[PDB]
Structure formats: C-alpha cells, structure tokens
Hints:
part of a larger assembly, 5 chains, A: alpha+beta, 1 helix, 13% helix, 15% strand, rod-shaped, E: four-stranded antiparallel sheet, 2 helices, 13 strands
Amino acid sequence: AVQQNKPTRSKRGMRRSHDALTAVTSLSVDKTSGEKHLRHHITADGYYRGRKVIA
Amino acid sequence: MRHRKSGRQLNRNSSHRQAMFRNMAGSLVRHEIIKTTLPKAKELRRVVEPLITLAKTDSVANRRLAFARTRDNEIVAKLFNELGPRFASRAGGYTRILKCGFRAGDNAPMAYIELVDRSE
Amino acid sequence: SNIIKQLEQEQMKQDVPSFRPGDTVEVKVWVVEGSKKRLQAFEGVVIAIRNRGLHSAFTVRKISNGEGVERVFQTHSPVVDSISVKRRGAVRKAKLYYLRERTGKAARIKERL
Amino acid sequence: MIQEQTMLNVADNSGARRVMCIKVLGGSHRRYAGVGDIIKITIKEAIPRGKVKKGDVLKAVVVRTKKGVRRPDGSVIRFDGNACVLLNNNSEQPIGTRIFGPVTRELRSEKFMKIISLAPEV
Amino acid sequence: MIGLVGKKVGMTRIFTEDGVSIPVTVIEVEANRVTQVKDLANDGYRAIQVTTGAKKANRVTKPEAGHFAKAGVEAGRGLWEFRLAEGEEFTVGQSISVELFADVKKVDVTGTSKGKGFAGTVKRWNFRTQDATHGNSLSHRVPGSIGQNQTPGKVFKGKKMAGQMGNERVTVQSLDVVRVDAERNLLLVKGAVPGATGSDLIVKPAVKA
RNA sequence: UCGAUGUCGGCUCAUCACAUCCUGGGGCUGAAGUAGGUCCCAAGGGUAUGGCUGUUCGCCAUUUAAAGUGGUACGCGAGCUGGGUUUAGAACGUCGUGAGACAGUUCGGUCCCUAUCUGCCGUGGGCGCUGGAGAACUGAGGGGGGCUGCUCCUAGUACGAGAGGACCGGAGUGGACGCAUCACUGGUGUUCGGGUUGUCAUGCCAAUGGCACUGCCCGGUAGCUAAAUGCGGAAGAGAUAAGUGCUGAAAGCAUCUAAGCACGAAACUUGCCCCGAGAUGAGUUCUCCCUGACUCCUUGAGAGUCCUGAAGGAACGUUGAAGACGACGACGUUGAUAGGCCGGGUGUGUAAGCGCAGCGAUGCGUUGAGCUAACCGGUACUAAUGAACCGUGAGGCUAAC
RNA sequence: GAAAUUCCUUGUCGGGUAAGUUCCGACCUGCACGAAUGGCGUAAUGAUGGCCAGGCUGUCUCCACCCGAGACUCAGUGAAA
RNA sequence: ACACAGGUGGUCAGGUAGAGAAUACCAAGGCGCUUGAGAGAACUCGGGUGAAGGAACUAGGCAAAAUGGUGCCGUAACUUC
RNA sequence: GAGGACCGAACCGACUAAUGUUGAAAAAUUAGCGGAUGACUUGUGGCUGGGGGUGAAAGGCCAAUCAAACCGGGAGAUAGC
Lengths: 55, 120, 113, 122, 209
C-alpha cells in the first residue's frame, strides 16, 4: 500500500507518456462569416453553418 | 450492464430528475431557447416534444394531461394556444440542439436547445 | 422483424375466445396415456392472461379435491383443444393473484352483467 | 423444488401430517426434488393411531409442488402446497392405502402405479 | 464441410402436433457468394471465402471494392472463410443457398456472445459469495484469496479474476435443425445460439455428429 | 527473524504431489457367478449435506461412484471472520497468611493500510515487422474441456445346486459441473398503468401535482437474469504404462527380447472449443494506392525548397444488444445513426368531461376507455456541414528474361 | 451435587433432535460443594448467561434485478504514510 | 488546531391529522449544506424487491424480516397475592 | 390518588450492528437500545491537591496525561545496555 523504493525520474516520465494533451488541429471555417470554430459547434458570434442562429 | 435501456440518470434520483425536466420544459416554452448542458438537452427532447404532440389536439382531457406534466398554467396556455397551432403540419422534431461550447466553471459541454420555428 | 412475425402468425390458432381475467373457463386438453389420446377438462377461473401473439398464455386456477391447482396453459398450442367460457367474472384487475390467498366465500367473484 | 428442511404435507393416509425432507436422493450434491423424485423424510407430526409414528425415518415421493411441473408444451401445473406419498425404505411402495388430492402424470413409471391407480385426479 | 454465414433474427417456437414446443433460433441465411477459392498450391490450404448481405456503395472501401470486382460478386457486410474437405470443390462467384442444410440434422453455430462488460468473479466465474452478515467487513463479492503464502510467492498464470466477460467468439455444438425454409432463406435450429439479435452467425454442420 | 515474520478453527479462492478414495487397464486369488482380498499401472476429471462441539478431529443421522492421503508459513487476516487461545472486569473450585496464581473452568471483551514494484486478470497507446493501405487467413505456440449414477436390452442367458446373478456390446434417462441464451416458466422492472392513507398546493368544485423509504401497495414493457431451456463433456486415431503375446536364438531344450513383429488405460500426442504472426523465426493470400520539379553539399550516404496529398486513416458528430476509459461496431444527408413522429404491439384496466340513477357515498352509459418506458414496423421532422487534418510522389544493397 | 465448582468426561441413565461435547431431569463414584469470604429455595425484575419452539424472513441453498452515493472519464484545486 | 456531521444554559412555539413538544405534511420564517459535468463496469457503502425452501447460515437467528394502534371479549402455571 | 410503578418524547445514558479507522469526529454517525418523578437530570458559583483528593470500587477519575497529574528545579541522575 506504499512503495518500498522511491521511483525514478525515468519511471515518472515513463508514466506520463500518455499524459500528453492532444491538440485539435481541426478548426472549421464558417461559410458566411469566416470565423474559425469547433466542428459542429456554433461560432463565437453565433453563426452556424451559414445561418445566424443565436445572435 | 445497460443493454437497450434509455433515460439518462444525470446523477439525480428519479424525483429530482422528474422535477428538473418539469422546470426545463417550462423554460423552453417561455423563452423558446435555453442554454443547458448537452446531456440535459437530448433528454429535454423526450420531455418537451410529447408536450407539443399533446398540444396539437386541443381538448380538455389533454389540457389537464399537459398540466399534470407541466405544473404551470402559463405553459399550458402557450403550448395549446401558440405552440400547438404553430407545429400543426410538422411530424416531430419540434426542437433542435446547437452545441455552443463549454461552460467556464466546470468544462461542461453546453448547448442551446430551441423550438425550430421561434416565430420572428 | 417481419420474419419472426410471419413465422409466428402461421402457427396461431383462429379459435381463441375472448375471455378476460375472472371468467370461468373450462379447457379441454389432449392427454396420451400410452396410445389413447383422451380429452380431459380443466375448469377453474382465469386469474392471469399473458397476451403475446404466439406466446400467449393464460393461467387457470381451480380447487380440486381440497387442493389449489394453477395451470398456465399456452394458448395457440395444439395440446389445448378448446377453450370455453362458462361464466364471466367482473373484476377490476388484470391479474387475480390475490385469489391464491382467498379461499372459499372470500374468493367469490361477482358475475359480469 | 423440495430440498432438505422442507416441510411437506402428506398426500396419503399413512398417519403423518407433516414430514420434513432430510435428504434429496439420487446423486451427490443434489439440490432439489421434483414431482417424481424420492426423498428421505422424517415425520414431524402424526395422528395418534396411524400406521407410522412421529420420529420415523423413511422415504417419500413428492407428488405436489408449489414450484410445479413443466409439460412438453411449456405449460405449468403448480399447486398450493407441497405433498408427498410416504414410502417404505426397503421396498419403496406406498405405506398408505388412499391418496388425497390430485397428482400429476409425471409419476407413470411402473414403480408408482399403485399411486396413479389410487389418486382421484390424474 | 462448409458452413454458411447467417444473422440471428431472434427466437420463437414451433409447435409440433405431438404437443411439444420446440424453441428455435431463427437464423436468416441469405445467399452466401463465394469471392475467393483457395488451393494447396498458391495458398497452402483449401478454402473458400464467402460474403453475404449487401453493403452500401460508399462504405465499401477501394481495397475491398476491387477484391469483390475480381470475383464479380457484389459487396458484403464482411468476409468469412471455410475450410474445404478434400472432395468438395467450389467456383468463385457461386452463390450457396440455405438449401445446403437439407440433410444435415445437427449443426454447430458460431457467434460473438453478448458482452457483459467488466464482470466480477461472482458473475464471471461462479465464485461463491461470502457472508452478507455475521461480521463480514466490505468483502461479499470480492474473490477472497488469490494465492498461497511465500512458497509460491506469486499468483498463478490463469487465475480466475474479474475482467471482460462475453463479447467473445463462442461455438455451441450439435444443435438440432428443426426446418430449413428455402424460400424465406431461413434456418431454424433448436435451442439458443450465441450472440444478440442481428449478430452474424456462422453455421457449420456438426463435426461430432 | 525480538529497531514485530499477526497463532487455532471457519469462509472464500485455490495449487501441487502420489504412497489412488472413485472411475480406467491388468497379474494372482483359499477368483463358480455376484460380491471381495491383495498387489501392479495410471493423477484426466470427480471426490457429501447435516446434528453436537470454538474446534481441527471425532462420534452420530442420512447420502454418494467415491466422500483419498499429503505438501503449499500445519496454503490463504495489506481477502473476510474472531468462536478458541492469550491483556485489562468479574466469579467458582483449588493453591497460597497474603498480593495473587492455575495450558482449571465461567460470563464480558477496538482485527488499520488510498497498492509503488513483482505476480495475476482484463484493456489500450507507441514502435516494429522495411513503400503505404484495406482485408481475409495460416497456426508456431498457449489455454479451456476432460466426472459419473441408474434403468433397459443383451438375458434371467454364461455360471451355480440351488439361491443368486454377470463379462463384453448397445439403448435411454439423471446428478454434479460448464458454456450459451431469454422463446417459454418466473424474478426484477424507483423511466408504464392503476388503487390508496395523511397533508400541502394549483382561487374553489371536479380534476391533478409535490412530500411522506418509490408514502404504502397491486400489476408490469424492454433489458438483465435462474429456479427457466439448449448444448457439451466424445467417438476416433497415434504412440505407450503395467500386462498378455507371436516368432526366436544366446543356452542343439526352452524363453514375450537379445534381431524382429503384434496387441494394451480416463494418463501422453491428437481429434473438440478458444486465444494466437511482437511466431523480432514479426509468416501467407487477394485487392487498393502514389509513377512531380529542382537546389545544396562531406558526397553511393544524403539534406533542403517548390510542387502535388493518393489509397486509406484519424478527428468530429449521431450512436450501439460494444463499453470503466481507450478500444470495438453501425452511421453521417447518395442518410433509418439517434431523438421525435405515425401506425401497431404490450402493460395497466373501463381516463376526463358529460349524461342518467340515488338523499348521499357511489353505481351505470359513453368505453375495455384513456394513458402506455427501453418493443416492432415505418417516416428525413430534428441532429449527424462543405471543409480542414494525418498519411505521399513507384519504394536499399541468384534464377529466369 | 458431574454444578459459573467434576480432572478423568462427550461419566451414566432419562427427555428433547433423523442425528445433541450444549440444554433439561436425575444418579452420587463431591479430582477439589456447604451453611452470613452464607447454604438451599424463591414470585417479580434483567440492553444478564445457556437451551428449545412458533412466527418470520436474501442468514442460507444461491443469488438475481433495481434505486441512489462513491469508484470511472472530463474540468478546477490538490494530500499522505 | 479547520468555514469541523460533535458539544453548548434559558425563553417563544401557528395550522391539518394525532393522545402528544411523537410523526407526517405545511405557515411565519430560514435555507439548498462553497467543487462541478458526464458515464451508468467490477467492487464497496446505503436502500428496495424476490420463484421454491425457510435457520439448512453461523460461535450465536448476528443482521434483516416480522410484531406494532384503539375499543371490546378473553388469558395459564406460579405467586411475596 | 401512591409508586427508586408502567408505556413513551425532551433530556440523561451507551446494549447491538454496520459505517468510519491517513475519519466529518484523537470515540462519531446511522438504524435499533436502557432510564425517563428520581439513589433522576441540569445551570451558575463553591469546596477537596498529588503518596494527596474523590471514588454505589474500575486502579476509576483528578484538564485528550494517572499502579501516583502537571510544571520548573536537583540534572548533563545513572545507563556493566
């Protein structure tokens, strides 16, 4: 329930081989306002798929 | 397991879950567009859309059915006198869901849900 | 699932009378002793109907020789020769499981008019 | 579904009122008895002048069961209580001379034909 | 002997006039179309690779849209293979019907069983539950001991622990063929076969027989 | 080992040995048969529930084919228990003047740990496998399984004096165990319908809603599930064990062995199912995909620009009888992927409102009505957006032609 | 009187149970009871010790399903031996 | 030691049920307990419900189930009445 | 109309079980449980002081400390470990 030996710099970074965040690299431009947005999300100004939805 | 089951529990007991959708169905009839989470929306679709199917036939026996599922007489009037005739020729799909991003306080995925006409 | 439906609806009988729970039916069943196919009767009260198309069943409960005997007949089965309603009971429930606890003038069912 | 410690009623006039199943016979680790199965019983309540007395250790065949039987049709015959016909240990024949209440025809085996030709129903 | 690939439609029953209800699993066995035969020379072994069903034109990818066009058959929802016994010889593009199973009387049905998820030792391995009461502290459906003391000093490879249950290929053998319907393309086999409704079943004849 | 390695028993979960308890194969028998006695071979699977006691044990009651013996810290407390022993209270007998003591009893008496590493069970990511990709395989190796009663025929025959009662060979049915599955029979079903008590609320009546463990209840769809129903433990081979042989000398006789050739068990290897090419010894098959310019230099080893981004993949979204998360699967408008909707089914059980009867509770009619979840069939109504992103440009150094 | 006391001891006999090292009734062979460190009874009383029975039940055979809180994923903060 | 599920004297004390300051639901009044969002694995807490059996569990009915109110009838051995 | 009477809240306790055991808490929570007109219970003052007190007696309690409290001193006791 507790370690017998302090793990190393090696094993601490080996565990964080999968802690690395994944960037999006998939921003989508809107066809009526040219805003980049998340795919299938509305824009910051409230356009979505060419239509003004939220305003 | 969970095979072929429906309904999100939403980390609520069944009474809180029933009272939360009674409120949230009331709010989608009031302002016709509300900003809720993405899993509380799509569960609101199973609540507010039978209310508009119910309001398509105006009768006393359905006005009290709508009142029993929406304990607010102002909602029952707008359902039957406004939203009923407005969705007369629509076969389902009275609401749409527009994902609007993430909540600041807890990173919850948010969405707008709104009636598909909104009459502007 | 029209495939199981067409496989089911070719085996259903066209001779199921419209009984309800509370009715007193008498169900003639075929029995083979060794080679004599005999037709014996089971006459009690319908206490439960399961409506499932081909998988429809109904439970008949009688008091035979001091004993409660329940019998869950599968209808649309070729062992049930005929079902015959002898009186119509007037109950407000679909499952009369409380008649296993009542026995006698307690278990009297008011006839349906 | 008669197992050990099951109190059964007595479907014959052999003297007993209540017996208790003290072994399900016919294979090791065997759990339940159906309506054709033989059980070792002890007599827990008898009538004062019968054939058997309270405390005898003998065999019985279960004839009525609240769990009930399963016909080839998928149909069930259940009963309101559990019953057995008390049998001799050595030559497993019925001790009694009458059979009270119905039986089912899961007993036609030509070891119980002096039960089918005694019982009122089936 | 070759199998056929089918789909679990569900379960129903047949009533013989004898009085028995035979529980069946309805298996839809559509026309399996041979896409590739195999030989001892080029491939090392003899088989046929069939396909069944119909896949839409925009989900079939180009490496398999060409593999189907080499045969001349349509697409399928998948490809499955069957080892050929040393007398039977098939042709590419031949459609095999459920008419194959006229004289078989007993089959083996393979399918992917229903996934139970991460099951526990009680559900997965029929471990016996410890006491619900009588003093027990937080240990009811836990497994108990997984080993010994110091002298093995390890758990043994193959220990029954909790893990993924179901979602696995399972073959049930020796199922009685009730009837073969050559016009609805149906095979009714007695009993239940692995898989849920809609899963792809692989029905070979019985090897044990 | 005293700078701590928690004792007996129980439970859970085991694992090995063989000096074998059952089942399998034999030799002898003071083996007629049936039952045995004994030894030999064999560890594949199986190998009781209870009463009493803290008990292990034991003794009893019933089983069973049998209830094996041992190892594993007298397996197993970072898995459980805490009855026993062995803290502090108290008492009895007993011993001491006494404090107190007793392998003497007797009641009472705190069992901690969020797992780093190994191990194990599952499940992914990376890279490799040498152009990339999509598949289907092969199967080296692993693993699972591997139990058995009883009846019937053989046949009341072989045997025996009779009593009794077979081998071998089939046939059927169970038991325990496993795998799968919900069609049935049921369980559950706080997402369905209804009854009902108290009380608050919707102005009130009537209708409803909240709260009281889902208020308490009666039913119950799908799913999940056993007690429910299917199936399975092979047969066959191959080598053998103990064993029995045949031929056959050394030893003109024999002799199963030395040359040779036969038979021979649930063990062994297969056959059955499953995993599996990270099998780095990285396999095979089919299909798909890309056949542009230049510039820079130590230079046969490349690097840098412009061009073109393929097959495919990923991401995203709708999701799933898939699932902890990843993964896996379906789908993405050339669309039934989910929600809705429509029809149906199912389950409840005759809604409300109205009318009538009655003093009223309430009944009756409209009416098997109305509601109806996860079901089935459909239906683009809503949402699944054009993109973009990753991955490139024909792939290093004998035979045939 | 084999007891809160009996080692041998699960004494022995009776009862209760299919079966009872516990219990109840005895017997007396009191290792090693005994008369105010009281002896024998004793109604009532007891969160007292032991035993039996009826009811009752997931205690169990043998567990299944469901409802919530965690576990699990995401975001924020952020220990411990 | 904490913005700590604990401790802390007295007073006031509405309605509807109810014997009641119990309890249930409410008023006046006060709050939603200073991390959320998902998901709906095992396992663990806290509950609900179970076919057939009913103590076979176990050291031991531990825990759970059950019983439960008012009125009336009726009630044993024993007893210090 | 008595009662160290009975049932049962406040209150005072603490029998059982589960949780908790780096807790919400250096003894608690949850469900049950005992007393509840009394040898009760509680507030506010007081008084008893360490070989001393107080004790319906457990070596109990005497400021989370008790077979001799705490603080300061002897004192850097001594320590064949």
